[PDB]
C-alpha cells in the first residue's frame, strides 16, 4: 500500500516500505539505506527489488547514507551490492552524498552509479541528506531518521513546505522523535501500510 499526496505541485507516493515514488520522474527515492548494517544486506536489496518490480522506475535516488561504515558492515556487502546493480543494469542510480558518504569515499567506481554532493536540485526540490533549509527550493532530506511514538516508535514521513523528511529505509535505533505538536503533515510507515496522522 501507499498514500498518494500532492506536494510542491508534484504527485508523490509515500510507500509503506519507507520510500517515495515520484511518478512524473519515474523515480524511486530512499534515504538512510545503511546497506550492510545489522538489526542483513540481502534483505535490504530484496526490498529494493520489490519496490522496483512494483513501480515503473527509471532511476533510483539515494538521499545519502548508502553503505554502512566499512569497519562494521556485513562481509561482502560491497560484492552483492555490485551484483544487484548490474542485475538492474538499465536502472539509473544517483547517490546524493551526505557527510558520511563523502568522508568514506563512497561509492566505489565499480558500482557504476552516479554520485553528487548535497544539495542536488531536481525540480522542484533540492534533494539533500542533511535536512537543512534551502534558500531557493523546497527540500527532501533524510539523515535524522524521523519516528513517531504511539501508545512504540514507528518510522514517520514528515511532509512540509520547507524541509520534508523521509523515514530511514534501513536499520536504525532511536531516531529523531516527531512530536504530535508538529505543524507538518505526518504519515506513519508500518505493517505494510501508510497511516496519515
Ligand atoms: Mn542515517
Ligand atoms: Mn546530524
mmCIF file of C-alpha atoms and ligand atoms in Angstrom:
data_model
loop_
_atom_site.group_PDB
_atom_site.id
_atom_site.type_symbol
_atom_site.label_atom_id
_atom_site.label_comp_id
_atom_site.label_asym_id
_atom_site.label_seq_id
_atom_site.Cartn_x
_atom_site.Cartn_y
_atom_site.Cartn_z
ATOM 1 C CA UNK A 1 0.000 0.000 0.000
ATOM 2 C CA UNK A 2 0.898 3.678 -0.399
ATOM 3 C CA UNK A 3 -0.551 7.094 0.343
ATOM 4 C CA UNK A 4 -0.774 9.425 -2.687
ATOM 5 C CA UNK A 5 -0.118 13.055 -1.780
ATOM 6 C CA UNK A 6 0.344 16.275 -3.681
ATOM 7 C CA UNK A 7 3.373 18.217 -2.552
ATOM 8 C CA UNK A 8 5.098 21.052 -4.395
ATOM 9 C CA UNK A 9 2.932 20.705 -7.474
ATOM 10 C CA UNK A 10 4.014 17.060 -7.755
ATOM 11 C CA UNK A 11 2.148 13.864 -7.043
ATOM 12 C CA UNK A 12 4.279 11.739 -4.706
ATOM 13 C CA UNK A 13 3.543 8.220 -3.456
ATOM 14 C CA UNK A 14 4.620 7.621 0.147
ATOM 15 C CA UNK A 15 5.343 3.869 0.239
ATOM 16 C CA UNK A 16 4.888 1.611 3.278
ATOM 17 C CA UNK A 17 8.426 0.260 2.885
ATOM 18 C CA UNK A 18 9.766 3.761 3.761
ATOM 19 C CA UNK A 19 10.307 5.183 0.301
ATOM 20 C CA UNK A 20 8.839 7.743 -2.066
ATOM 21 C CA UNK A 21 7.768 7.012 -5.635
ATOM 22 C CA UNK A 22 7.712 10.071 -7.904
ATOM 23 C CA UNK A 23 5.583 9.141 -10.937
ATOM 24 C CA UNK A 24 6.302 12.182 -13.118
ATOM 25 C CA UNK A 25 10.032 11.390 -12.952
ATOM 26 C CA UNK A 26 9.564 7.593 -12.710
ATOM 27 C CA UNK A 27 11.829 7.970 -9.682
ATOM 28 C CA UNK A 28 12.180 5.883 -6.506
ATOM 29 C CA UNK A 29 13.562 7.943 -3.594
ATOM 30 C CA UNK A 30 15.122 6.406 -0.464
ATOM 31 C CA UNK A 31 17.215 7.778 2.396
ATOM 32 C CA UNK A 32 19.439 6.228 5.031
ATOM 33 C CA UNK A 33 19.713 2.776 3.500
ATOM 34 C CA UNK A 34 22.762 1.823 5.613
ATOM 35 C CA UNK A 35 23.429 -1.258 3.459
ATOM 36 C CA UNK A 36 25.285 -3.868 5.465
ATOM 37 C CA UNK A 37 24.072 -2.650 8.868
ATOM 38 C CA UNK A 38 22.647 -5.386 11.083
ATOM 39 C CA UNK A 39 19.416 -5.185 13.058
ATOM 40 C CA UNK A 40 21.088 -8.038 6.592
ATOM 41 C CA UNK A 41 22.494 -6.949 3.210
ATOM 42 C CA UNK A 42 20.421 -9.449 1.215
ATOM 43 C CA UNK A 43 17.227 -8.245 2.931
ATOM 44 C CA UNK A 44 17.742 -4.562 2.092
ATOM 45 C CA UNK A 45 18.465 -5.314 -1.577
ATOM 46 C CA UNK A 46 15.444 -7.622 -1.784
ATOM 47 C CA UNK A 47 13.137 -4.857 -0.552
ATOM 48 C CA UNK A 48 14.522 -2.577 -3.277
ATOM 49 C CA UNK A 49 13.941 -5.382 -5.806
ATOM 50 C CA UNK A 50 10.278 -5.489 -4.759
ATOM 51 C CA UNK A 51 9.811 -1.725 -5.000
ATOM 52 C CA UNK A 52 11.481 -1.714 -8.418
ATOM 53 C CA UNK A 53 9.180 -4.530 -9.546
ATOM 54 C CA UNK A 54 6.063 -2.780 -8.194
ATOM 55 C CA UNK A 55 6.562 0.657 -9.805
ATOM 56 C CA UNK A 56 7.838 1.861 -13.182
ATOM 57 C CA UNK A 57 11.209 3.278 -12.076
ATOM 58 C CA UNK A 58 13.804 4.612 -14.497
ATOM 59 C CA UNK A 59 16.005 5.929 -11.679
ATOM 60 C CA UNK A 60 16.791 5.313 -8.021
ATOM 61 C CA UNK A 61 17.862 8.340 -5.960
ATOM 62 C CA UNK A 62 19.505 7.846 -2.555
ATOM 63 C CA UNK A 63 19.321 10.801 -0.174
ATOM 64 C CA UNK A 64 22.615 9.952 1.499
ATOM 65 C CA UNK A 65 23.830 7.201 3.825
ATOM 66 C CA UNK A 66 24.110 4.408 1.276
ATOM 67 C CA UNK A 67 26.696 1.977 2.674
ATOM 68 C CA UNK A 68 27.157 1.215 6.348
ATOM 69 C CA UNK A 69 30.600 2.055 7.751
ATOM 70 C CA UNK A 70 33.240 -0.194 6.200
ATOM 71 C CA UNK A 71 34.696 -1.314 9.517
ATOM 72 C CA UNK A 72 31.306 -2.551 10.781
ATOM 73 C CA UNK A 73 29.315 -3.601 7.728
ATOM 74 C CA UNK A 74 28.382 -7.185 6.938
ATOM 75 C CA UNK A 75 31.023 -9.175 4.997
ATOM 76 C CA UNK A 76 30.804 -8.987 1.191
ATOM 77 C CA UNK A 77 28.184 -6.215 1.386
ATOM 78 C CA UNK A 78 30.030 -4.459 -1.433
ATOM 79 C CA UNK A 79 30.000 -7.589 -3.592
ATOM 80 C CA UNK A 80 26.287 -8.294 -3.767
ATOM 81 C CA UNK A 81 25.505 -4.590 -3.960
ATOM 82 C CA UNK A 82 27.577 -4.802 -7.154
ATOM 83 C CA UNK A 83 25.729 -7.914 -8.336
ATOM 84 C CA UNK A 84 22.408 -6.250 -7.513
ATOM 85 C CA UNK A 85 23.330 -3.134 -9.501
ATOM 86 C CA UNK A 86 24.333 -4.989 -12.646
ATOM 87 C CA UNK A 87 21.267 -7.166 -12.268
ATOM 88 C CA UNK A 88 19.469 -3.803 -12.597
ATOM 89 C CA UNK A 89 21.715 -2.845 -15.483
ATOM 90 C CA UNK A 90 19.218 -0.461 -17.108
ATOM 91 C CA UNK A 91 18.400 1.322 -13.832
ATOM 92 C CA UNK A 92 19.971 4.746 -13.411
ATOM 93 C CA UNK A 93 21.152 5.241 -9.805
ATOM 94 C CA UNK A 94 22.088 8.537 -8.098
ATOM 95 C CA UNK A 95 23.686 8.786 -4.667
ATOM 96 C CA UNK A 96 23.293 12.229 -3.165
ATOM 97 C CA UNK A 97 26.135 12.308 -0.663
ATOM 98 C CA UNK A 98 25.953 13.485 2.902
ATOM 99 C CA UNK A 99 28.962 13.979 5.148
ATOM 100 C CA UNK A 100 29.409 10.287 5.964
ATOM 101 C CA UNK A 101 29.222 9.191 2.309
ATOM 102 C CA UNK A 102 31.727 11.817 1.134
ATOM 103 C CA UNK A 103 34.141 11.201 4.018
ATOM 104 C CA UNK A 104 34.012 7.469 3.289
ATOM 105 C CA UNK A 105 34.891 7.976 -0.370
ATOM 106 C CA UNK A 106 31.630 6.282 -1.314
ATOM 107 C CA UNK A 107 30.681 4.873 -3.683
ATOM 108 C CA UNK A 108 33.362 2.693 -5.284
ATOM 109 C CA UNK A 109 33.587 3.283 -9.028
ATOM 110 C CA UNK A 110 32.863 -0.375 -9.812
ATOM 111 C CA UNK A 111 29.268 0.158 -8.618
ATOM 112 C CA UNK A 112 28.567 2.210 -11.798
ATOM 113 C CA UNK A 113 26.226 4.665 -10.099
ATOM 114 C CA UNK A 114 26.093 8.428 -10.251
ATOM 115 C CA UNK A 115 27.286 10.478 -7.311
ATOM 116 C CA UNK A 116 26.647 14.137 -6.438
ATOM 117 C CA UNK A 117 27.074 16.136 -3.240
ATOM 118 C CA UNK A 118 24.034 17.570 -1.460
ATOM 119 C CA UNK A 119 22.166 19.689 -2.435
ATOM 120 C CA UNK A 120 21.210 18.393 -5.859
ATOM 121 C CA UNK A 121 18.288 20.220 -7.443
ATOM 122 C CA UNK A 122 15.717 18.105 -9.283
ATOM 123 C CA UNK A 123 12.840 20.441 -9.940
ATOM 124 C CA UNK A 124 11.019 21.421 -7.891
ATOM 125 C CA UNK A 125 13.061 20.038 -4.977
ATOM 126 C CA UNK A 126 16.514 20.446 -3.551
ATOM 127 C CA UNK A 127 17.451 16.852 -2.713
ATOM 128 C CA UNK A 128 19.721 16.522 0.318
ATOM 129 C CA UNK A 129 20.835 14.196 3.057
ATOM 130 C CA UNK A 130 21.086 16.748 5.867
ATOM 131 C CA UNK A 131 17.659 18.365 6.489
ATOM 132 C CA UNK A 132 18.699 21.959 6.435
ATOM 133 C CA UNK A 133 16.589 24.669 4.742
ATOM 134 C CA UNK A 134 17.490 25.620 1.177
ATOM 135 C CA UNK A 135 17.371 29.217 0.018
ATOM 136 C CA UNK A 136 15.610 28.670 -3.302
ATOM 137 C CA UNK A 137 13.907 25.256 -3.282
ATOM 138 C CA UNK A 138 11.828 23.035 -1.005
ATOM 139 C CA UNK A 139 13.962 20.246 0.439
ATOM 140 C CA UNK A 140 13.578 16.483 0.512
ATOM 141 C CA UNK A 141 16.049 15.097 3.026
ATOM 142 C CA UNK A 142 16.815 12.334 5.477
ATOM 143 C CA UNK A 143 19.619 11.793 7.999
ATOM 144 C CA UNK A 144 17.658 12.253 11.279
ATOM 145 C CA UNK A 145 15.566 9.019 10.951
ATOM 146 C CA UNK A 146 12.177 10.579 11.846
ATOM 147 C CA UNK A 147 9.939 8.475 14.101
ATOM 148 C CA UNK A 148 6.571 8.932 15.785
ATOM 149 C CA UNK A 149 5.637 7.404 19.145
ATOM 150 C CA UNK A 150 2.306 5.599 19.544
ATOM 151 C CA UNK A 151 0.812 4.341 22.818
ATOM 152 C CA UNK A 152 6.107 2.346 20.076
ATOM 153 C CA UNK A 153 8.442 4.244 17.726
ATOM 154 C CA UNK A 154 7.404 3.980 14.083
ATOM 155 C CA UNK A 155 9.207 5.491 11.077
ATOM 156 C CA UNK A 156 7.458 8.662 10.001
ATOM 157 C CA UNK A 157 7.204 10.621 6.755
ATOM 158 C CA UNK A 158 7.330 14.355 7.547
ATOM 159 C CA UNK A 159 5.874 16.430 4.694
ATOM 160 C CA UNK A 160 6.449 20.174 4.994
ATOM 161 C CA UNK A 161 6.751 23.142 2.654
ATOM 162 C CA UNK A 162 10.316 23.981 3.753
ATOM 163 C CA UNK A 163 12.019 20.686 4.623
ATOM 164 C CA UNK A 164 10.453 17.254 4.231
ATOM 165 C CA UNK A 165 11.944 14.160 5.912
ATOM 166 C CA UNK A 166 11.926 10.583 4.588
ATOM 167 C CA UNK A 167 11.978 7.806 7.170
ATOM 168 C CA UNK A 168 15.156 5.754 7.176
ATOM 169 C CA UNK A 169 14.953 2.954 4.635
ATOM 170 C CA UNK A 170 17.477 0.813 6.533
ATOM 171 C CA UNK A 171 18.141 -0.331 10.082
ATOM 172 C CA UNK A 172 18.430 2.263 12.839
ATOM 173 C CA UNK A 173 17.903 2.646 16.564
ATOM 174 C CA UNK A 174 16.187 5.545 18.321
ATOM 175 C CA UNK A 175 15.606 8.264 15.724
ATOM 176 C CA UNK A 176 14.500 11.875 15.964
ATOM 177 C CA UNK A 177 11.041 11.797 17.544
ATOM 178 C CA UNK A 178 8.476 13.906 15.688
ATOM 179 C CA UNK A 179 6.035 15.192 18.314
ATOM 180 C CA UNK A 180 2.248 15.453 17.816
ATOM 181 C CA UNK A 181 2.638 19.259 18.040
ATOM 182 C CA UNK A 182 4.418 19.319 14.666
ATOM 183 C CA UNK A 183 2.915 21.702 12.118
ATOM 184 C CA UNK A 184 3.892 19.367 9.257
ATOM 185 C CA UNK A 185 1.836 16.598 7.641
ATOM 186 C CA UNK A 186 2.777 13.237 9.162
ATOM 187 C CA UNK A 187 2.455 9.732 7.710
ATOM 188 C CA UNK A 188 3.434 6.577 9.592
ATOM 189 C CA UNK A 189 5.020 3.562 7.884
ATOM 190 C CA UNK A 190 4.392 0.113 9.332
ATOM 191 C CA UNK A 191 2.829 -3.348 8.879
ATOM 192 C CA UNK A 192 2.764 -2.876 5.085
ATOM 193 C CA UNK A 193 0.560 0.257 5.247
ATOM 194 C CA UNK A 194 0.967 4.041 5.393
ATOM 195 C CA UNK A 195 -1.045 5.804 8.085
ATOM 196 C CA UNK A 196 -1.828 9.525 7.696
ATOM 197 C CA UNK A 197 -1.944 11.163 11.132
HETATM 198 MN MN1 LIG B 1 21.488 7.518 8.514
HETATM 199 MN MN1 LIG B 2 23.370 15.192 12.312
#
